[PDB]
Amino acid sequence: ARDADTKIWNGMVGELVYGKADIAIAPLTITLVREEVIDFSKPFMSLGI
Amino acid sequence: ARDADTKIWNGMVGELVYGKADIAIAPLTITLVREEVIDFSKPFMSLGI
Amino acid sequence: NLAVLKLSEQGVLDKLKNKWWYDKGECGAKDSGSKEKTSALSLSNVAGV
Ligand SMILES: NS(=O)(=O)c1cc2c(cc1Cl)N[C@H]([C@H]1C[C@H]3C=C[C@@H]1C3)NS2(=O)=O
Ligand SMILES: NS(=O)(=O)c1cc2c(cc1Cl)N[C@H]([C@H]1C[C@H]3C=C[C@@H]1C3)NS2(=O)=O
């Protein structure tokens, strides 16, 4: 997620944003704020809380 | 669907393929054979056969 | 994005999902619960008599 007040994505999303990774096949939830920095494909598995 | 031997997409497909209609908020199902001619957003309602 | 749809339409997703969730059914407790109060008695409730 982003850090408080700095907008620093830690974790895997930062590994996509900061040019460290190439692709992330992972159990990753399509949220709102993740769209603005990285792209998602169509969803493949449906779920809920 | 497309026409045999001429690829004439009829229905609501050709309205967007052939520049006729501008946008289609409608019960349309994302397939493989539809991404090549038009584009879809993220899916908003799940279903099955 | 194009590849995901081919996997979805060929059902490899369902195959892998069953492979990695349900085919590893070990602790198959399988308690669901039916409210049908007209269920008869088994012998196993009575055999002590
Ligand atoms: N029931 S589920 O989460 O495992 C699941 C969820 C989805 C599947 C396939 C499965 Cl098995 N394919 C769909 C896509 C296929 C096509 C139709 C909608 C999308 C395009 N995305 S999805 O709706 O996210
Ligand atoms: N319960 S439902 O079918 O009406 C339904 C189905 C869907 C909803 C929301 C609802 Cl309420 N949003 C999801 C989107 C949200 C995010 C995650 C996947 C997509 C992006 N698509 S969906 O899975 O098609």
Curated annotation (Swiss-Prot), chain C:
Q: How is it modified after translation?
A: Palmitoylated. Depalmitoylated upon L-glutamate stimulation. Ubiquitinated by RNF167, leading to its degradation.
Q: What induces it?
A: Down-regulated in the pyramidal cell layer of CA1 in the hippocampus by global ischemia.
Q: Annotated site (Interaction with the cone snail toxin Con-ikot-ikot), which positions?
A: 6
State the compartments where it is located.
Cell membrane; Postsynaptic cell membrane; Postsynaptic density membrane
Tissue and organ expression note = Detected in forebrain. Detected in dendrites of neuronal cells. Expressed in the pyramidal cell layers of CA1 and CA3 and in the granule cell layer of the dentate gyrus.
Q: Could you name the domain of life of the organism this protein comes from?
A: Eukaryota
**What family is it from?**
Belongs to the glutamate-gated ion channel (TC 1.A.10.1) family. GRIA2 subfamily.
Other comment = The postsynaptic actions of L-glutamate are mediated by a variety of receptors that are named according to their selective agonists. This receptor binds AMPA (quisqualate) > L-glutamate > kainate.
What does the record's free text say on domains? The M4 transmembrane segment mediates tetramerization and is required for cell surface expression.
Assembly and interaction partners:
Homotetramer or heterotetramer of pore-forming glutamate receptor subunits. Tetramers may be formed by the dimerization of dimers. May interact with MPP4. Forms a ternary complex with GRIP1 and CSPG4. Interacts with ATAD1 in an ATP-dependent manner. ATAD1-catalyzed ATP hydrolysis disrupts binding to ATAD1 and to GRIP1 and leads to AMPAR complex disassembly. Interacts with GRIP2. Interacts with GRIP1. Interacts with NSF via its C-terminus. Interacts with CACNG2, PICK1 and GRIP2. Interacts with GRIA1 and SYNDIG1. Part of a complex containing GRIA2, NSF and NAPA and/or NAPB.
* Protein purpose: Ionotropic glutamate receptor that functions as a ligand-gated cation channel, gated by L-glutamate and glutamatergic agonists such as alpha-amino-3-hydroxy-5-methyl-4-isoxazolepropionic acid (AMPA), quisqualic acid, and kainic acid. L-glutamate acts as an excitatory neurotransmitter at many synapses in the central nervous system and plays an important role in fast excitatory synaptic transmission.
What's the name of the protein? Glutamate receptor 2
